[PDB]
Structure formats: structure tokens, C-alpha cells
Amino acid sequence: RTDTLLQLDNQLSFALYSANLAMHKLYRGLLKALDLTYPQYLVMLVLWETDERSVSEIGERLYLDSATLTPLLKRLQAAGLVTRTRVIIALTETGRALRSKAGAVPEQVFCASACSLDELRQLKQELEKLRSSLGA
């Protein structure tokens, strides 16, 4: 009997997949004013904390390979938010200015999660533990 092992409700992957999509849906609404997609927003988070990073450094930080990150950088550059120069990525004046408009986003996500601070930190910790166990 192998069926119970494959029931949808018993898959850790599906819970992760569906919660991540729900998070994306929430962000599409939260990032509307700053015209960013979630992954693009992640790149900006990296730059707003540490500017002038190489593509390799950003990819290592976000756990993204070149093929997935490059399109994000291209879109950010075309929007005038970052520069790409031989590759090193840096914020433009408007890209740096965008940070002030994203200040309320984290709090909005915290509220929507319905988690207490400890529940959020505990969940985040377990997810990071899982990420480390799954990845090389």
C-alpha cells in the first residue's frame, strides 16, 4: 500500500508551494505603488542594505542562479532603478529613493501573517533550517 504516502495533504512541498503563492498574491497588491514584482523587490532589498554588489554576490544572497536573476536585473535597469556595469549592480538615485516608499511593506506582511512575533521568528527559523538541509 503506497497511496497514503502520496496524498496531497501529506506533502511538505505542497504546503510550501501554496503558502509561497499566497505570499506572492499578497505582495502583488502591496508592491503595486512601487511597480515591482516580488523577485525584483528582493534584489532591491539586497542593494538597499549593501550597494554595489556583483551579480554573483546577489545570486548567492538570494539563492538564485544567473539564468533566473539576470532577467530581474534587466527589468530593474530598464525601469531606471539600478545600473549594470562591467557585472556590478548599483542603485541609481531613483532606485535609492524608492527605499522610502517600501518602508511600510514589511509591517503589512507581518499583520497579514496573523503571527505573533515568536511564531513568525519560529516559522522563519524552521524554513531557514529546511532551506539549509535541502540545499547544497
Next chain:
Amino acid sequence: ARTDTLLQLDNQLSFALYSANLAMHKLYRGLLKALDLTYPQYLVMLVLWETDERSVSEIGERLYLDSATLTPLLKRLQAAGLVTRTRVIIALTETGRALRSKAGAVPEQVFCASACSLDELRQLKQELEKLRSSLGA
């Protein structure tokens, strides 16, 4: 204020979720190669292996996916001869039903790779379920 601390990558629950999901996805690209399926196509098979002969709507509300997202997947499953379409209503084929036996190795390896205890895995799954619900409400 120190809006910089609120915006740090390492302080985002969403990133921990996004990156753990990505790691799980990468693992699955390797695991599913033996079944020659993509993750979403696999999810559809999971639904059918538990409850066969389902409508596109039923499969959708089970996976929290809309018809527009499911349509391409079902056509690929059909082309692979794992599923048939009866006009709406998706049913497993002999081949699709047989694929279940070898699919068991997927959850098996995921558990091993997760380096979690049974209790830890189900507890994390429960919290993620709670979050999905909360985010949508």
C-alpha cells in the same frame, strides 16, 4: 526611523518562505525526472491518485489553482497518455495509474533530504497551512 532594519533581507519571513520553496523546487526537478513530470503536473497526479475522475474545477479548488493555470498542465498530461479528458472530468489511464507505484520514491527522498523528524515535518506543514489561510483571509 531605521527603516533599513525593517527592510533587511534576513528579516523577511517571505524570503525564508520563498527560498525554502525554491530549494524544494530544485530538489523536485531532480526527483521528478524519473516520472518525467513537472511539479504542477505532479500535483495534479497526486489529486487523481487519491481521488480519480475529477472535474477541472475540483482539481483546481484542491490545488488552489485557477482553470487557466490547470488547462496547459492537463493537456500535457493527456499528451503523455497519463490522463484522458471526457466532456471537464479528468481520469487516470492505465499508464497514469501505474505511475503511482514508482512515484512513492519521491516523498520518500523528500523526507530524507529535509533532515526533519516526522513530527517536525508535519508541524512545519501545519504552520505553512495556517499561513496560507491567514494570508488569503
